Symmetry: D2
Subunit: 209 residues, 4 copies
Amino acid sequence: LSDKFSAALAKNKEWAAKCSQEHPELLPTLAVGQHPEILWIGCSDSRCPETTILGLLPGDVFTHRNIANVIHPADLSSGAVIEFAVRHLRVKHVVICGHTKCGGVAAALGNKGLGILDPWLIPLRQLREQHLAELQSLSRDEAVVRLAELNVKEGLKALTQKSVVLEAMQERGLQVHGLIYDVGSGFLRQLDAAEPEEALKARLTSFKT
Amino acid sequence: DKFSAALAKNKEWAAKCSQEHPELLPTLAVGQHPEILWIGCSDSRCPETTILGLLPGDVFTHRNIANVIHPADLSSGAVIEFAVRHLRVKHVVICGHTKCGGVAAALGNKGLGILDPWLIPLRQLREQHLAELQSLSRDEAVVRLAELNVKEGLKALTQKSVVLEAMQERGLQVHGLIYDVGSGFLRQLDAAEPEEALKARLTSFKTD
Amino acid sequence: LSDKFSAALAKNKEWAAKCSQEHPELLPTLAVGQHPEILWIGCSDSRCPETTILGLLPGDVFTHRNIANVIHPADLSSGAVIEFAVRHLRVKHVVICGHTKCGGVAAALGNKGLGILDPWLIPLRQLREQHLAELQSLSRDEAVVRLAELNVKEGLKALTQKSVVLEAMQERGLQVHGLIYDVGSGFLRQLDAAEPEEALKARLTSFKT
Amino acid sequence: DKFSAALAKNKEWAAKCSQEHPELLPTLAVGQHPEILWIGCSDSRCPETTILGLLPGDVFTHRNIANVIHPADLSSGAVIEFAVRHLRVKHVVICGHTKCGGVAAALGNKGLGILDPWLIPLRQLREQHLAELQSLSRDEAVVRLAELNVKEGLKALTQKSVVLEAMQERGLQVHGLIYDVGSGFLRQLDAAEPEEALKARLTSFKTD
Ligand SMILES: [Zn+2]
Ligand SMILES: [Zn+2]
Ligand SMILES: [Zn+2]
Ligand SMILES: [Zn+2]
């Protein structure tokens, strides 16, 4: 039965042939330089390929995907992506997308040791501690969704606790957005993700350099 | 507004998926079973699922600046642990690309703030291969250092007990590619190491 | 003659001579194996050498020192020290020691960009944002002290959001302590670092493996 | 017991310091001017200020498991930036030591949880030098890998623009030591590199 790696390289050649036949200017024009307007921070989960689920093309979405779309404030991996997207490509939108049935969110609600995943998941366990009574009042499936939403909202806070982001929000109206992707339906939903404007004033004072 | 345009295109895409693959999304909701972990660049021109002609559920994905594997990076570390031990992917692919902004940054000497520590592995390869890279044009050096970065990434990937375990226990394979953003073609890298190399790595890294 | 490095190697040999003369069994007995009962997490600040300011000897204090004694939850540097000290050496005490006139705490209350220090100092700026009204109500010098104390208390919280620490606290009565070192007087003062008992219960539920 | 005993000994030490160095604490109350950055092991037997016969204010200090320099580690990165750029230390010392638990862990094949990613650089040196280390006794291998770790750390330390700038601008020096926990003596390591090596590093790492 088929080697999925070999099958993928053959499907890549078919995709390159389709590009050459249907849109022969697209890839050569993108090779001159990318100009995406969107930074996507989402989960590595194979069911959440940003460009496919958004109905977009190569060149549209600058992408970071990690376990459970977690923003550790001092993580160089997300830190370097955000610096490059915001300062160098000047994206207009930063999207943090969580998803239903997230294995990283579910791991954080369990109490099994998962080796190197344990430090990675600490931010999710911090949210679990802070919201423990609320999460215990929900079904397992509702708790995984609620913690996924709380994680997206906390990530948007962490994202704005960066001078490069606050500068872009003041200079060009950079927007930040929280989404949940429903792996069962294919639909994205927006999170309210409200903060008092008081919140951003304190953050500006505390973080702009 | 590209954000509101993308949400409208998402709804259209999800509706079309329900009509043209009616079993896909409901079966994916039960559980993912991807056979491939892709480690690639965040570059907007390298969306793994589209360039491979695949579907949602096929590729477990990590994308960062210049597809760099720092040995002790928890972000790539956690992805590799989850993909290899929990999802049991059969393939790990590191994919570099032509016209990589991270590779180009590393060949320059401009300070880029938080990017500077991130790009150290590329500058280590630049130092190690300095005569070879200086013998090339800037455009040729950006390709060459992209290739050297993929090959070094495959070494870093295999200096992990979780990977070495899966290679011996269940035949996990690792692969290096370069994506040409101008042609849409993936090229396989030779990425040769003597078998002697994996023996010393097993001794040095595999834990009980 | 002015070279502090060569002067330090000469003073090292004088110190080795003093050990051989005054306590000839000490270093050979320590060479058999270390048994410190204290893990110290302090600032790199040259004024805070733990073994000297505690009046202790080599072998007494397992030590981590970093900029402003910051505990990033997912930092492998502090993570590995804590794992080794708590699980393998079985220390009885973990001390987080902040200090007066901390340059890292002062940096976090300023708005100058300090390159690679910026991500490192984010937890201090998070405390600044959370306590902004309180810190703005104080003099510059009082704010530097207050933020230094808030940083030690936040570090003790981060330290207990680790299964290895919670396990040792329950199984063998490991204790954790917050101190401030006054660089001008040489005195250590203890911080209260009391938590509502609800807090510790939720942390056990949320973090113990 | 030992915690309350240490607080009482602290007060006695501060009282004795006021009598035997009456200018020291009042000068330190206002600031610090150490000329040395020490990067050493957390090992309780390697307290830098004590083994150097120095005082508070003399040694800006970073201690971690096995004195490992991960190139992109923000913990060591932030210390080096602060010491070199802001305090303008004249010397950076990396000190390894005999009977190092982290070095010994890297030569074993037991899984140690969060220590495993931390110890990768030691296992990379073990792989690179495997034949040489297998030719030695356990005790000789622990010393040899400790020395290889100090030398690799000095390379990582100099692959930083802040260090290279200080070396060129103000003659910052870097030094590798091994501390013998049994004798109390520091030994200097030869730590030779072709001058060719530092030139390629300057080209590859110094920001304009
Ligand atoms: Zn997920
Ligand atoms: Zn790239
Ligand atoms: Zn300090
Ligand atoms: Zn050691």
